Every structure is written in structure tokens, then in C-alpha cells.
């Protein structure tokens, strides 16, 4: 297949704007195929000392194929750009949802807490870490699946992520591992049910005492088995974390009372439940 040049699309809207890249609607205009095409400006890439982060994202993504995860269809270049293209999920962040419906109901927040569990399970059996997982990198199909997106940041068996979302070993030890992935997780069930992180403060910098002190509480309003599997999680000791290999893995984690009614075989095939 032929390289792609910019003068295959018409380009559309910003879907999103990050430090180092911007992305953006484009229809291709042989195949009127929409995708969002990640441009990144290689100068930039370059003062900034980011190239081995987009070569990282671009190498992970290459080897993903599962439906939960941004797919990579191509890549091409002019003199001064990098352009990714990318599945462009219609449906956009979950955040939005959370902000938008204020916070999920039982159903909804064990159907969608199981399809990250499950593409965390499909990326930590690659020997990847995302190392910056939050809902604003977790996108929403035309069918509201999720697709997990986002990973110039992870690495492959230094880098810190989202203060609401990093673990205690990144702000005490500095090296991170598939569990720091599993605290994440954590963050983001609670943040399902609650409507809100767990850890949140004036500043960074009280968000980060909160965590190596793990100071936050649960609402009263709080799905029990749901409180049950998210202690299990936040757990300052990442060897303790259900879902991690010291602890068998995820198993353990798939097994747990909140995932009772869970078939996690064809998630993908499933209809979720509508969000409200
Ligand atoms: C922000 C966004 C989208 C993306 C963001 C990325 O970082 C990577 C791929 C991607 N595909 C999208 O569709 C979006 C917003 C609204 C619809 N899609």
C-alpha cells in the first residue's frame, strides 16, 4: 500500500490537544474513512528530547491488536510534521460521561471497570505498562466500547503520570511496574462510583501526601463489593495489589465478588448498558 501523504484527507475539528501533539478529524478522501490522526511537529519532538517517547508509542502500538486499545492503521511524514493515523472513537473520553451523568451506576461501572481489567490483562500479557492510565485516556466508540488510548508514556519489560493517578512507589521509589496500573485502576472505579478521584487536594503537591498516607474515604452511597475490591487495590504495597503477579495475577482479580455476573470471554460482543 501506496504512503500516505496530508493530501489524502480532508482535516476537520481538534479531537484533542496534548504537550507534545495535537489531534485531529481527518476523512480520507478516497474511502471517505474518518480517522483521527495524531500530528506531532518533529522540531518540537526534538528541543523537547521526546523522540524516544513517540518511537516508543508508535512501536506499542504496532504490536496491540486487541479491540479495547486505539488501533494503528498508518504512519507518514512531510518536512516538518509526524502524522499518526488512529481509530477515531466517536464517542470520545469517559470522562465526559462521569462529568456528564455525574457518576455510574452498579451495572454500568462493573461492565466498563471489566473491559479495562481485561485489556489490562490483554497489555500486561504483552510486557507492557501504561503508566498513564485515566479516563481521559480511555475513549468511547460508535458502541461504547472503550478504547484505551495514549501510549508515548508506557513502558515495555524515569516517566511519571497524572497526579491523581500515580502510585506511591512512583513518589517514594521512582520505578514503576504492571501494579502501578492496578492502583490506577483503583482510582478509576472509585472515581466510577463516586464521581470523583479519590485523591484530590489544593495542589500537586497535597495530592501526593494524601497518597503515600493513602488518606481518602469512601461515600456511604459506595457499592459495597465494589469498596471491597477498591481497597484491595489502593494498597500502598504493590506486591499486595489483587491482579498483580505476587499475587497470581489476574485471576484473583477477575474472580472477585463485584465481577460475579461477568462473562469475560467476549466482552467486546456484549451491549453495554446505556449510561444515565
Ligand atoms: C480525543 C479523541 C480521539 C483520540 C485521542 C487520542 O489521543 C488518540 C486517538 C483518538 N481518537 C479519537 O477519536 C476524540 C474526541 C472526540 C472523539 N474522539
Not at 495514549?150 to 520505578?175: I, M, R, W
Not at 502501578?180 to 478509576?188: N, R, Y
Given at each position: 500500500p501506496r504512503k500516505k501523504r496530508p493530501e489524502d484527507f480532508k482535516f476537520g475539528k481538534i479531537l484533542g490537544e496534548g504537550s507534545f501533539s495535537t489531534v485531529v478529524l481527518a476523512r480520507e478522501l478516497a474511502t471517505s474513512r474518518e480517522y483521527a490522526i495524531k500530528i506531532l511537529e518533529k522540531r518540537h519532538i526534538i528541543k523537547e528530547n521526546k523522540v524516544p517517547y513517540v518511537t516508543r508509542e508508535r512501536d506499542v502500538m504496532s504490536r496491540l491488536d486487541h479491540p479495547f486499545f486505539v488501533k494503528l492503521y498508518f504512519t507518514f511524514q512531510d518536512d516538518e510534521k509526524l502524522y499518526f493515523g488512529l481509530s477515531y472513537a466517536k464517542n470520545g473520553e469517559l470522562l465526559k460521561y462521569i462529568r456528564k451523568i455525574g457518576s455510574f451506576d452498579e451495572t454500568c461501572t462493573r461492565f466498563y471497570t471489566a473491559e479495562i481489567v481485561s485489556a489490562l490483562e490483554y497489555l500486561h500479557g504483552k510486557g507492557i505498562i501504561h503508566r498513564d492510565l485515566k479516563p481521559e485516556n480511555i475513549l468511547l466508540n460508535?458502541?461504547?466500547?472503550?478504547?484505551?488510548?495514549?501510549?508515548?508514556?508506557?513502558?515495555?519489560?524515569?516517566?511519571?503520570?497524572?497526579?491523581?493517578?500515580?502510585?506511591?512507589?512512583?513518589?517514594?521509589?521512582?520505578?514503576?511496574?504492571?501494579?502501578?496500573?492496578?492502583?490506577?485502576?483503583?482510582?478509576?472505579?472509585?472515581?466510577?462510583?463516586?464521581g470523583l478521584p479519590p485523591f484530590r487536594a489544593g495542589n500537586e503537591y497535597l495530592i501526593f501526601q494524601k497518597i503515600i498516607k493513602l488518606e481518602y474515604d469512601f461515600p456511604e452511597k459506595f457499592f459495597p463489593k465494589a469498596r471491597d475490591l477498591v481497597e484491595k487495590l489502593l494498597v500502598l504495597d504493590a506486591t499486595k495489589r489483587l491482579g498483580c503477579e505476587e499475587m497470581e495475577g489476574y485471576g484473583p482479580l477477575k474472580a472477585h465478588p463485584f465481577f460475579e455476573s461477568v462473562t469475560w470471554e467476549n466482552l467486546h460482543q456484549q451491549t453495554p448498558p446505556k449510561l444515565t
Open positions: 460508535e458502541d461504547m466500547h472503550i478504547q484505551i488510548t495514549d501510549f508515548g508514556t508506557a513502558k515495555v519489560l524515569s516517566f511519571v503520570g497524572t497526579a491523581q493517578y500515580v502510585s506511591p512507589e512512583l513518589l517514594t521509589e521512582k520505578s514503576a511496574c504492571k501494579s502501578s496500573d492496578l492502583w490506577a485502576l483503583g482510582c478509576i472505579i472509585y472515581q466510577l462510583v463516586a
